[PDB]
Amino acid sequence: KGPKELESINASMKSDIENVRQEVSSYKEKWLRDAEIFGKITSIFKEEL
């Protein structure tokens, strides 16, 4: 392949990795908060069961 297309796809892969890391961190934080709330609610259910 050509050098210009090579640099272009390299920059694109870098930006994609960056955005993927950011979105993964955001979704992980959201899932952690929601799972914490769900566990706080389900503690009583587990104690009862």
Binding site: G2, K4, E5, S8
Partner: protein
């Protein structure tokens, strides 16, 4: 000498357009908007153009 000059003039002027050979025309465009390419506006990079 005049005959030599005339024959060499014909040889030279024959050699520019007709007997010429040019680049390979590998194509790559950066702009995303462009979708159709004329295939003749392709020029070599300035670094190559100066050296040539």
């Amino acid at each position: 000498t005049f005959e030599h000059l005339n024959r060499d003039t014909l040889r030279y002027i024959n050699l520019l357009k007709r007997l010429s050979v040019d680049l390979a025309k590998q194509v790559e465009v950066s702009d995303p908007s462009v979708t159709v390419y004329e295939m003749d506006k392709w020029v070599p990079s300035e670094k190559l153009q100066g050296i040539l």
